[PDB]
Design an enzyme around this catalytic site. Structure first.
Site, PDB file in Angstrom:
ATOM      1  N   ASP A   1       3.012 -38.425  58.502  1.00 46.27           N
ATOM      2  CA  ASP A   1       3.211 -38.212  57.102  1.00 46.27           C
ATOM      3  C   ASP A   1       4.677 -37.868  56.764  1.00 46.27           C
ATOM      4  O   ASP A   1       5.117 -36.439  56.930  1.00 46.27           O
ATOM      5  CB  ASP A   1       2.176 -36.786  56.938  1.00 46.27           C
ATOM      6  CG  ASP A   1       2.256 -36.534  55.563  1.00 46.27           C
ATOM      7  OD1 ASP A   1       2.659 -37.261  54.344  1.00 46.27           O
ATOM      8  OD2 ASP A   1       1.646 -35.339  55.270  1.00 46.27           O
TER       9      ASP A   1
ATOM     10  N   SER B   1      13.574 -44.708  41.581  1.00 48.83           N
ATOM     11  CA  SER B   1      13.529 -46.059  41.591  1.00 48.83           C
ATOM     12  C   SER B   1      14.247 -46.828  40.113  1.00 48.83           C
ATOM     13  O   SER B   1      14.348 -45.917  39.210  1.00 48.83           O
ATOM     14  CB  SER B   1      11.747 -46.534  41.555  1.00 48.83           C
ATOM     15  OG  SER B   1      11.665 -47.819  41.056  1.00 48.83           O
TER      16      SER B   1
END
Ligand SMILES: CCN(CCC(=O)O)C(=O)c1cccs1
Ligand code: NA
Length: 330
Positions: free
Chosen positions: A35, A199
């Site tokens: 994770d 992004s």
């Protein structure tokens, strides 16, 4: 040193991926969920409340000649999905894919929430976010990656998740055979303890690319792609009959649909998520409404590039002094 381990989807939907991990001496092999959005290595154990264990493999520290109680240390964690676990702490030898750490904090669960009990395939979590998020008190502990880092050939790990197929986690090297083209690197902020990046925009299907900054985290422990409501509405508007259902808790769409791809930007690079990756199948057995793999983050407080996004790419988690993320097509 390096390590290389295969990661396998737990079910036919790629809801999560499990990776075998050797703990203790002689080795006890547990299948852990790696994770990148958390920083605790915790396991089902001989200490876990018996009614909360249903088919998991447990770690038994009393059977390990290298286990030591970390006296006084406790832990307690709550995840973004509402699940939780807590317990006490041992140090022991932990190996992943041939890479060994001695003295790793192994958090032994005394209590787990129902979602853990009900998932027989996941024996615990191995956190790969920054050690500033580790929940051990009163002495915070290091992640497996932070403990391995100085011994690695290069201070990196890579995630290469499969679509309905196994993939690979590598530590200490970048497999130049595992991706196509070049790797595009991008800045990370560690201010919240996550692999947080920005992004450069998105496209839906064959549509024009929209240049827009989208902060979010790279999180292998989250199944879906969670993005701002504007972006998610623009995606699902291209699918006949798709809608948000608050009854189901997310976007649904007719199972008869063909889904468009979704592209996200990494600098001037583009990663394309095929439409099939965004299908999470019926909302209940036999239903003709299907659950979407791209959902709104508006009720989270962060955008999350979970497995739907990451398994479209070869992802480099660069833990050098200035951390970066890298993405490549594959
Ligand atoms: C000059 C662009 N560039 C590298 C992009 C590439 O990997 O080609 C960067 O600005 C980076 C900033 C932080 C990490 S890399
Ligand atoms: Na679900």
């Amino acid at each position: 040193s390096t390590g290389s381990a295969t990661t396998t989807p737990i079910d036919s939907l790629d809801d999560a991926y499990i990776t075998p991990v050797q703990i203790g001496t002689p080795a006890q092999t547990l299948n852990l969920d790696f994770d990148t959005g958390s920083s605790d290595l915790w396991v089902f154990s001989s200490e876990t409340t018996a009614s909360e264990v249903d088919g998991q493999t447990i770690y038994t520290p009393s059977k390990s000649t290298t286990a030591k109680l970390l006296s006084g240390a406790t832990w307690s964690i709550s995840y973004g999905d509402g699940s939780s676990s807590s317990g006490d702490v041992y140090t022991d030898t932990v190996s992943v894919g041939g890479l060994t750490v001695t003295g790793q904090a192994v958090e032994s669960a005394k209590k787990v929430s129902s979602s853990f009990t009900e998932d027989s395939t996941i024996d615990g979590l191995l956190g790969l976010a920054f050690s500033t998020l580790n929940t051990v008190s009163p002495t915070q502990q290091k992640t497996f990656f932070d403990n391995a880092k100085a011994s690695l050939d290069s201070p990196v790990f890579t995630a290469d998740l499969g679509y309905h197929a196994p993939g690979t986690y590598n530590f200490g090297f970048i497999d130049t055979t595992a991706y196509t083209g070049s790797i595009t690197y991008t800045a990370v902020s560690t201010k919240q303890g996550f692999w947080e990046w920005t992004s450069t925009g998105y496209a839906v299907g064959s549509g024009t690319f929209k240049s827009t900054s989208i902060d979010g985290i790279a999180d292998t422990g989250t199944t879906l792609l969670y993005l701002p409501a504007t972006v998610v509405s623009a995606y699902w508007a291209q699918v006949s009959g798709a809608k948000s259902s608050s009854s189901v808790g997310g976007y649904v769409f007719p199972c008869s649909a063909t889904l468009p791809s979704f592209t996200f930007g990494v600098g001037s690079a583009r990663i394309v998520i095929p439409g099939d990756y965004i299908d999470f199948g019926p909302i209940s057995t036999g239903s003709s409404s299907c659950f979407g793999g791209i959902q709104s983050s508006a009720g989270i407080g962060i955008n999350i590039f979970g497995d739907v996004a990451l398994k479209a790419a070869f992802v480099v988690f660069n833990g050098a002094t200035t951390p970066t993320l890298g993405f490549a097509s594959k």
